Amino acid sequence: AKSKNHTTHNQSRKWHRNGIKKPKSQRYESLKGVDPKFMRNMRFAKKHNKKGFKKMLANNAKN
RNA sequence: UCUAAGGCUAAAUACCGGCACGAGACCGAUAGCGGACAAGUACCGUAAGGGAAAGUUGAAAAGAACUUUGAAGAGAGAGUU
RNA sequence: UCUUGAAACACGGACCAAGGAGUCUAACGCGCGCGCGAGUCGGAGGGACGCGAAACCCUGUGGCGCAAUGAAGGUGAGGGCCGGGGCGCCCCGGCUGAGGUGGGAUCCCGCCGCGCCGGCGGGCGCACCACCGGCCCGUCUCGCCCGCCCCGUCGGGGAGGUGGAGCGUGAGCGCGCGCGAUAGGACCCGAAAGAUGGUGAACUAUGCCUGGGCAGGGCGAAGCCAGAGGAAACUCUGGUGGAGGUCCGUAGCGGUCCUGACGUGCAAAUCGGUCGUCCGACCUGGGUAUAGGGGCGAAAGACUAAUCGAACCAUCUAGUAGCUGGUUCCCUCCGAAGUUUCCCUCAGGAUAGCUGGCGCUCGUCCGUCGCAGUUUUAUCCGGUAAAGCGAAUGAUUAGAGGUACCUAUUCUCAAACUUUAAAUGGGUAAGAAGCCCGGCUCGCUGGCUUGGAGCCGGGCGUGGAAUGCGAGCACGCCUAGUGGGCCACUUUUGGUAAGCAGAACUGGCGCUGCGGGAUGAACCGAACGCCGGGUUAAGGCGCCCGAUGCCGACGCUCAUCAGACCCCAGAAAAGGUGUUGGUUGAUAUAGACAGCGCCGAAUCAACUAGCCCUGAAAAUGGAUGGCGCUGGAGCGUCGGGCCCAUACCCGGCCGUCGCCGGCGCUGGGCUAGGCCGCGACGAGUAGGAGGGCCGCCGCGGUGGGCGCGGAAGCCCCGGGCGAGGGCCCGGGUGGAGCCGCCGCGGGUGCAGAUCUUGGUGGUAGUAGCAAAUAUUCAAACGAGAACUUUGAAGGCCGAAGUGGAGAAGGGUUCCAUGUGAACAGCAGUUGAACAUGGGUCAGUCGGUCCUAAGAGAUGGGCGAGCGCCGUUCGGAAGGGCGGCCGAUCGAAAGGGA
RNA sequence: UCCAAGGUGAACAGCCUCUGGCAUGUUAGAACAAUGUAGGUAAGGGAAGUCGGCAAGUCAGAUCCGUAACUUCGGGAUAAG
RNA sequence: GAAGGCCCGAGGCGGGUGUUGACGCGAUGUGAUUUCUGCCCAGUGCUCUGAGUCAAAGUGAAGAAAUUCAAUGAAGCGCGGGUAAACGGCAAGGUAGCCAAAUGCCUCGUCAUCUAAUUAGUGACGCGCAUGAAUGGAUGAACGAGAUUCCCACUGUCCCUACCUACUAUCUAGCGAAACCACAGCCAAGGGAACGGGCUUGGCGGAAUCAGCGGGGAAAGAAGACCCUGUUGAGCUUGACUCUAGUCUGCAACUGUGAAG
RNA sequence: GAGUUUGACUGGGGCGGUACACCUGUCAAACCGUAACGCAGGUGUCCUAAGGCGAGCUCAGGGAGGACAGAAACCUCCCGUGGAGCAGAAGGGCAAAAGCUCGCUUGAUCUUGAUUUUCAGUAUGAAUACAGACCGUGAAAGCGGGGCCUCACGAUCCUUCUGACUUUUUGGGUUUUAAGCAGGAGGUGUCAGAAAAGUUACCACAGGGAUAACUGGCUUGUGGCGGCCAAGCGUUCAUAGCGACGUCGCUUUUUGAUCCUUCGAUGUCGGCUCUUCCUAUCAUUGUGAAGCAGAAUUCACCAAGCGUUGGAUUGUUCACCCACUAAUAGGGAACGUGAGCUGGGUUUAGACCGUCGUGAGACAGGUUAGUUUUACCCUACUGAUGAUGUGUUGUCGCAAUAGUAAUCCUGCUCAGUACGAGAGGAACCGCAGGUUCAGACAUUUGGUGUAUGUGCUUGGCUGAGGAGCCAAUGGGGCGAAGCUACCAUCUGUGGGAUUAUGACUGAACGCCUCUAAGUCAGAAUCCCCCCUAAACGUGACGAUAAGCGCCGCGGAGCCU
Numbered sequence A: 001a002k003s004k005n006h007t008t009h010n011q012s013r014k015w016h017r018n019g020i021k022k023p024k025s026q027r028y029e030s031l032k033g034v035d036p037k038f039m040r041n042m043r044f045a046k047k048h049n050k051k052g053f054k055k056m057l058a059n060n061a062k063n
Numbered sequence B: 001u002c003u004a005a006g007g008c009u010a011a012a013u014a015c016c017g018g019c020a021c022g023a024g025a026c027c028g029a030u031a032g033c034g035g036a037c038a039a040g041u042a043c044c045g046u047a048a049g050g051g052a053a054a055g056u057u058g059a060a061a062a063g064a065a066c067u068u069u070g071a072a073g074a075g076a077g078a079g080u081u
Numbered sequence C: 001u002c003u004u005g006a007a008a009c010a011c012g013g014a015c016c017a018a019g020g021a022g023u024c025u026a027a028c029g030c031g032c033g034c035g036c037g038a039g040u041c042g043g044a045g046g047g048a049c050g051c052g053a054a055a056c057c058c059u060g061u062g063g064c065g066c067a068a069u070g071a072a073g074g075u076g077a078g079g080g081c082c083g084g085g086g087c088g089c090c091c092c093g094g095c096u097g098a099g100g101u102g103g104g105a106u107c108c109c110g111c112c113g114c115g116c117c118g119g120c121g122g123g124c125g126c127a128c129c130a131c132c133g134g135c136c137c138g139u140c141u142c143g144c145c146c147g148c149c150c151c152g153u154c155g156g157g158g159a160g161g162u163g164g165a166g167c168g169u170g171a172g173c174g175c176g177c178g179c180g181a182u183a184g185g186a187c188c189c190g191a192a193a194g195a196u197g198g199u200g201a202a203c204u205a206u207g208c209c210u211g212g213g214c215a216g217g218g219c220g221a222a223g224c225c226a227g228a229g230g231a232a233a234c235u236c237u238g239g240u241g242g243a244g245g246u247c248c249g250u251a252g253c254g255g256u257c258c259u260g261a262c263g264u265g266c267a268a269a270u271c272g273g274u275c276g277u278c279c280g281a282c283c284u285g286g287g288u289a290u291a292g293g294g295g296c297g298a299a300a301g302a303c304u305a306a307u308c309g310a311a312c313c314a315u316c317u318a319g320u321a322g323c324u325g326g327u328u329c330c331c332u333c334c335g336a337a338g339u340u341u342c343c344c345u346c347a348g349g350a351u352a353g354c355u356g357g358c359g360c361u362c363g364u365c366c367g368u369c370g371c372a373g374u375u376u377u378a379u380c381c382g383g384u385a386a387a388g389c390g391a392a393u394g395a396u397u398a399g400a401g402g403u404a405c406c407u408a409u410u411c412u413c414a415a416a417c418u419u420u421a422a423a424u425g426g427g428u429a430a431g432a433a434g435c436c437c438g439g440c441u442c443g444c445u446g447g448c449u450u451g452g453a454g455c456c457g458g459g460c461g462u463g464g465a466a467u468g469c470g471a472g473c474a475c476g477c478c479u480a481g482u483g484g485g486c487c488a489c490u491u492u493u494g495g496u497a498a499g500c501a502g503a504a505c506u507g508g509c510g511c512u513g514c515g516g517g518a519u520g521a522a523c524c525g526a527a528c529g530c531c532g533g534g535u536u537a538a539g540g541c542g543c544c545c546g547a548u549g550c551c552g553a554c555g556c557u558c559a560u561c562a563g564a565c566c567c568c569a570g571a572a573a574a575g576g577u578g579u580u581g582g583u584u585g586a587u588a589u590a591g592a593c594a595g596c597g598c599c600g601a602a603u604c605a606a607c608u609a610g611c612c613c614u615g616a617a618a619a620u621g622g623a624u625g626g627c628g629c630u631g632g633a634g635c636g637u638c639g640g641g642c643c644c645a646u647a648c649c650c651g652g653c654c655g656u657c658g659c660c661g662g663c664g665c666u667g668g669g670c671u672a673g674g675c676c677g678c679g680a681c682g683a684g685u686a687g688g689a690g691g692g693c694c695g696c697c698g699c700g701g702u703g704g705g706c707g708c709g710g711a712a713g714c715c716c717c718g719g720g721c722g723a724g725g726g727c728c729c730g731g732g733u734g735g736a737g738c739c740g741c742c743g744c745g746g747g748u749g750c751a752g753a754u755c756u757u758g759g760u761g762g763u764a765g766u767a768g769c770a771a772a773u774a775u776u777c778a779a780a781c782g783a784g785a786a787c788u789u790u791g792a793a794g795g796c797c798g799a800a801g802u803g804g805a806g807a808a809g810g811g812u813u814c815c816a817u818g819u820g821a822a823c824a825g826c827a828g829u830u831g832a833a834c835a836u837g838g839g840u841c842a843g844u845c846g847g848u849c850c851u852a853a854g855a856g857a858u859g860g861g862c863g864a865g866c867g868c869c870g871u872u873c874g875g876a877a878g879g880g881c882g883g884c885c886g887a888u889c890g891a892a893a894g895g896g897a
Numbered sequence D: 001u002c003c004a005a006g007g008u009g010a011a012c013a014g015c016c017u018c019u020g021g022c023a024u025g026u027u028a029g030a031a032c033a034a035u036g037u038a039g040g041u042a043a044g045g046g047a048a049g050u051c052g053g054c055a056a057g058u059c060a061g062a063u064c065c066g067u068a069a070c071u072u073c074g075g076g077a078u079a080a081g
Numbered sequence E: 001g002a003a004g005g006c007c008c009g010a011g012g013c014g015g016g017u018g019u020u021g022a023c024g025c026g027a028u029g030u031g032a033u034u035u036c037u038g039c040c041c042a043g044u045g046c047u048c049u050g051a052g053u054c055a056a057a058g059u060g061a062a063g064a065a066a067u068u069c070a071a072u073g074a075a076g077c078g079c080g081g082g083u084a085a086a087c088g089g090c091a092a093g094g095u096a097g098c099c100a101a102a103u104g105c106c107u108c109g110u111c112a113u114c115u116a117a118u119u120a121g122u123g124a125c126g127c128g129c130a131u132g133a134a135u136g137g138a139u140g141a142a143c144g145a146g147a148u149u150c151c152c153a154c155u156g157u158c159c160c161u162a163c164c165u166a167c168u169a170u171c172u173a174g175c176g177a178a179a180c181c182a183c184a185g186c187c188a189a190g191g192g193a194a195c196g197g198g199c200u201u202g203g204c205g206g207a208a209u210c211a212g213c214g215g216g217g218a219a220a221g222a223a224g225a226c227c228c229u230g231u232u233g234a235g236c237u238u239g240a241c242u243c244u245a246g247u248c249u250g251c252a253a254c255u256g257u258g259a260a261g
Numbered sequence F: 001g002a003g004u005u006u007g008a009c010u011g012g013g014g015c016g017g018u019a020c021a022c023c024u025g026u027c028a029a030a031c032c033g034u035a036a037c038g039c040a041g042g043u044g045u046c047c048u049a050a051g052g053c054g055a056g057c058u059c060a061g062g063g064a065g066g067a068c069a070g071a072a073a074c075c076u077c078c079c080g081u082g083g084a085g086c087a088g089a090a091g092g093g094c095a096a097a098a099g100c101u102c103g104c105u106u107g108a109u110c111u112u113g114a115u116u117u118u119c120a121g122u123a124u125g126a127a128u129a130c131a132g133a134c135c136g137u138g139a140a141a142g143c144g145g146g147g148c149c150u151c152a153c154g155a156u157c158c159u160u161c162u163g164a165c166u167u168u169u170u171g172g173g174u175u176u177u178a179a180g181c182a183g184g185a186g187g188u189g190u191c192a193g194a195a196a197a198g199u200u201a202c203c204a205c206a207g208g209g210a211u212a213a214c215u216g217g218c219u220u221g222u223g224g225c226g227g228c229c230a231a232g233c234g235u236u237c238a239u240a241g242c243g244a245c246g247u248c249g250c251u252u253u254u255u256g257a258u259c260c261u262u263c264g265a266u267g268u269c270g271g272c273u274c275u276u277c278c279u280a281u282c283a284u285u286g287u288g289a290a291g292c293a294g295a296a297u298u299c300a301c302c303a304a305g306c307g308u309u310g311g312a313u314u315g316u317u318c319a320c321c322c323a324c325u326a327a328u329a330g331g332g333a334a335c336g337u338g339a340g341c342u343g344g345g346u347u348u349a350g351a352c353c354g355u356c357g358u359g360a361g362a363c364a365g366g367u368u369a370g371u372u373u374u375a376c377c378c379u380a381c382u383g384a385u386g387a388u389g390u391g392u393u394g395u396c397g398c399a400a401u402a403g404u405a406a407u408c409c410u411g412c413u414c415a416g417u418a419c420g421a422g423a424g425g426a427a428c429c430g431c432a433g434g435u436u437c438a439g440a441c442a443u444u445u446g447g448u449g450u451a452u453g454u455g456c457u458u459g460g461c462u463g464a465g466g467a468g469c470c471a472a473u474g475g476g477g478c479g480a481a482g483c484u485a486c487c488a489u490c491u492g493u494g495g496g497a498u499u500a501u502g503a504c505u506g507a508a509c510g511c512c513u514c515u516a517a518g519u520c521a522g523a524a525u526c527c528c529c530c531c532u533a534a535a536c537g538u539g540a541c542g543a544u545a546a547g548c549g550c551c552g553c554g555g556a557g558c559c560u
């Protein structure tokens, strides 16, 4: 009472039945798996980014 | 915190059996109880047990006198409604 | 119906009627509707007071939410702006109450083009999403501050990672509807089994008790008698006797062979002939004993009531079933899978995929986002085909040269070889998430703004390839079915091969009809609402059979097995001086070829290619589909015309779907859940969803409904309506109830289930009414005589009877009269039928009495207990000085006046 | 289970009859085909049939004779003829 | 040898054998007589001895105790002996016998006999696939509804059928079922689920029926007993898993009195 | 004694194998992926270094050399792209490396999260890149948290160990104990992980044509059969008859392969019986060829009309043998044929023996005994009524079509002839019979015989005789009629076109030629006659009832 072992015959039709969908490209992709030492300093760059907010307003006025 | 190795004690509670009632968005004679009827009857098995089928003339029997064919069932008229 | 495949020589279905299969309760999830809403619900109970067991009111105990997290001790969720100060990296004050980036329906404003309408310029940005902070709990690393009456092994906080079903201005709760997965009998029907309790030894197996029965003959044992022989011991002969798991054989009991008869029988084991045994381990009745995992067995798993390799009965029990079978109205729309992973899985599930439903977030003139089974451009990837081995590895042929090697060549190869190397194919990119200019943050990086990344401001569309197209929400949420596939081109593995087995890719079949191939699940064409006209595809156009009934074109071919077109349904090697082409050569008018120098013009050889032919043998008679066709109806090359598919074009109608559709501004109109307009579209199994003014039963409403002037039901060569489910009307029949509309509750729709119950067919006036010799004549009664009765004749049983009486069993069958309806398988004047009466007389026949094997109380013992064990074993004498030793039951064949 | 006539014969065998009983066994008439079931015969050959002398047939009573191999001395034995 | 063997039994001062007592009862094997009954005690099993493992209870030790440790340490196992008319084999290597057998694969063995002809039969031969001695070997009169070979006799078994009789069938009067049945019923070929009756192309096809018949309907009769599957069973068996009645053994209790070592 | 278990995959199942958890090369068709009990292999380990780092060094092999010393000992030089080695299978990688050697070592340590691969994108296993510690090494840059890379491994529960702490040990406190958190290990190889021996023929149930045994279907390896080529055989001569080395086919009477149909069942081996079919012809008919003188035989052609037998053994098909014969050819039809038979084999349950298993049991080893059911239904076939439309009815005929039938041999004669040296030894016509078959038939012979015909006779009965009866036909002798037997007897048949083949004329092709056009002979084959049947076919002819037939275009009308 043997049967069939492996088949990929009708699988291409099933895959394209709803179409092969790529993940929607999102701005600001996820930062998972990045260097932890790099992520530490990048958090500190955003943590103290408001410290130079007064210099930003002064330099924008020169333009 | 209680005082075992002694006892008693109603109510609220349970009830498919029985007795007597009320009811139904239930079943309507192959349904509802097996059983609407001489149903746990007929019938079967040595026995323990198994277990049916089967309700309806019309309002009122007024259920067809009488005549005639046939031995008779069974018919033809007549008659009741 | 299962299936890859069914008209199947696969299964179910003779026929009709009624019944007949997805339910209900609990709990869960999602969607939807309703109420209230950081709440929400009385679902216990209490109180008002026919239908009222309702409804009304109160009660928030409690449940579920509002807080999470850790194993636990436990602890436990506020962001931002402004100013000052500290300059590390986090103090103070104030104003507020969830931040920042990108996107964002809607709203707001400016300007322009026309207080309306379009351009691009900004803003507040919902929900949601991507990302980055922040906070709470667990845990880890690095740590230097702080708090106190219970200063300690005390309790607090920081910084940076990380775990969590968190917080980040709640969304739940109650109720109802639907679907999905469950547990319950669980869609219906079905096991082989298992368990508890009980009933059977009238069959049979065996022991016991008490009875009964078993012709006629054969051989003829021990004992005995007599006569003989012998010197004796002892022997011999005749007769007698009547022994035995002896022989022939009847009854009886068995059951060999015919593998006979029968085999829907006389019979759920019989009949005939034949056969075994028939004084014995013989046969048999009755009374007793042993009871189901037990009994009993001269042993066959035999037998234990037609049941035995574990009886029967009822219950547990609607036992379970990954396995078969069946699973009931119509329509509209969408529409599969036999594949992935895991599984004591491989007839099955879980999971992913494919499916459907429900939506939701947006877009919806150009424009811009966004999208793609496709090209283009740019740039990468690979090691297959082919090639190579005078290159590596491996294999391999032949010579040559120099001195078996060695050099230079040469032949042939690789799938597990390769220097090379495609075609097809895979990945990425083709901008605003960009470019450009100027700054800011950092604790990372460091010779040095040096990097890097993040952030801020400003400026710049020619959107920065072609084409098509609406997208997004981890392609959201729930989700059925499927998880046996099969076939074809190409590629490809095993196999001699296979209508074989196993893969890749795409299409197809399955799920699919249609035209064509005669025919046929897959091939060719083309996919499907209902029609009209037209035109085609593939394929055809002698006739069957629509179309060449053209003065079609050119050749090829004769077949005493001609040939006749994808898949495709019989041919090969090798041959032909059949015929027709072509190729390469060779002789010849200084005269060849062939034939006897004559002859006088071409000839010969090899090879190749078409058609035909040989090669070519199978069994029922037969297959270009058939007829038949040979100036073609054959083969090849083509032309014009013609034939028709559910395909294409145009038109009508129906439905679905889509319109940033239209209409509240009324002769008609607007049941807005309506009406109207436009465009496209239409296959379907399993499956899903919606609609039904389809149908059935019952309820609350409602129609001042219907009905003896005729309801329901039923019948109809009556009239109709609807695409259909169905419905209305008319007639006939019927005789008392019935129906429409809005809601509500289901035991709601049948052709199947070797369905259930009931009824009826063909078979069919058929099988049959055939075991045991046999009836006939006359008469009588009578409507009626092959069957009754009487008489006569002829026969049978032939005293181990077809005779005369009992036992067990039957229970009025006995007897008389009467009936002829049903029964007595023909008939019947007859009956063991039916109806009405009658009939069984005991001291001395049996029961009754006795105990036989047995059974069974008392004492006693056991046992949870109903009870069981036990038949002497205890103060056991109810009589007339007593012995008894075991009450009682147990024989209609024992005992017994 | 009980009673059990005559003839034939060794016989309660088979066959015939008497006493007694019965009407041919849940039907009849006609016909006499095949094929059956049951019964019987068959010339000549005699198991050539067939898995196989299956079935059938031969033999049979009694009387007078005659009776081996073998043997457990009993038998074989109704040997056989 | 009865305080027993064997067995029943839920249970007792229970019950059977047993109204018994070794010439008995119980459990097995072989299977009259005659004739023999060989070898192996390793394995398994039974049985018989007194020198590692060994439960509970009891004793000792440590510890606050629970607990732990130690010593002691039954039966059984292990060790040892016997046993094969125990299972078995031939630790022993098949002895006496027997045979191509009811036992021989090769095989229709070889030889003789039996017939014209013999895979049969018989007598022999035996390195016997795979005979063999109470898992009994060999023989054997009588006996056998046992298997087998031949001969005589006999016969319709046959060559080779025929005829006769009885009851049926058949016909009639009366009476009157059942299995079965999707629809049904003439074929060839083709295709097809690869053996059509129906479809395709042909052959062709004429009411209603009787008696026969056994080709067909892959005829009927029965949800194949063969084969496989099922995480379906049952009967039986063991060196299967897990238990158990029974039985053996140990401890304290019922269990008292006294002496001695 | 009770309960339960006794894996799965699988070209049925079992046995075998593990394709059951993994790895390499290939298959695999140039991304990845991709199956089979596809191919060639590996794995349940090994390593305190064979881990880590640094430094130096260069291998396999070859040439030339150098006491013993040689084809291989060691020393030296030169060449040497790795042709060595790197623990193992294979692939890849690797040269002042990853190899070899040496000296310092324990990054094979303590942690958080992310990622890759198998993937459902779960787990495990094994990997990748960081980060925070603590270290090793090197002068340092760096490198290292196992092995150069691709394999070398394991959930819950439970036990055990280590570590940590405001962790619990339940009204508090202390100490034991127990529990918990976190990280290891003890293992499930059926490797995402039950706790597991059989037997069943005494078997049971659910099913399955998803799946075996029997037919058919595809295939033809094998079997059978037949070509082609021509080495050679045939004294010589390849092809009279043969055919090596090769090679191309056919057949479905072998077997195998496959598993498509059937497991709510297609009765299954042989024989018997019986019909038809095939030819790959054994015999007969007509021919061609020879290593054909005759005879016998061999090869080949047209050809299946006709025939292919009787027996011993065996269940057997198949073989073997005895004879006979013209020959004793080969097969199909569901391996034709079981509601046709027969049960011998096989193929339930009983039983024996051998081998096997401890056992129950098994054995395609042997042996013995073992129920063979139903037709009356539909077609088919066999016969029997009848139906058909021309008025009824009858006689006498025609005839489509269908069936079809004869066959083989012997003796005599030719003829001791032809032929041959002989030995031997035919043929045509003719003649006499026979075999098998067919259709008849009973005069004769045989058989049956219930004319129950006539005798004989047994038992019984009728009083006896006489005459008879009964015994399922009492028995027996003979026997009419009838029926019946190669067991008696009779009869069995003519042509036509042609096949094979041999020829004529005669081209193609000045010749030749059976052929191309045209002609001839020509057969057991074929067709037909003869013969049997007689159609929804029919001709001639007779007789045809107050009814009825002809004749008045009867003369007018009604239905179809």
Ligand SMILES: [Mg+2]
Binding pocket: A003, A004
């Ligand atoms: Mg599968």
Ligand SMILES: [Mg+2]
Binding pocket: A005
């Ligand atoms: Mg597999």
Ligand SMILES: [Mg+2]
Binding pocket: none
């Ligand atoms: Mg009550």
Ligand SMILES: [Mg+2]
Binding pocket: none
């Ligand atoms: Mg009722």
Ligand SMILES: [Mg+2]
Binding pocket: C008, C009
């Ligand atoms: Mg078929």
Ligand SMILES: [Mg+2]
Binding pocket: C011, F264
């Ligand atoms: Mg079925």
Ligand SMILES: [Mg+2]
Binding pocket: none
């Ligand atoms: Mg049926």
Ligand SMILES: [Mg+2]
Binding pocket: none
């Ligand atoms: Mg109904």
Ligand SMILES: [Mg+2]
Binding pocket: none
């Ligand atoms: Mg925003």
Ligand SMILES: [Mg+2]
Binding pocket: C194
């Ligand atoms: Mg059980």
Ligand SMILES: [Mg+2]
Binding pocket: none
């Ligand atoms: Mg005798």
Ligand SMILES: [Mg+2]
Binding pocket: none
């Ligand atoms: Mg007798």
Ligand SMILES: [Mg+2]
Binding pocket: none
């Ligand atoms: Mg009998």
Ligand SMILES: [Mg+2]
Binding pocket: C259
């Ligand atoms: Mg019989």
Ligand SMILES: [Mg+2]
Binding pocket: none
């Ligand atoms: Mg019969």
Ligand SMILES: [Mg+2]
Binding pocket: none
């Ligand atoms: Mg006898």
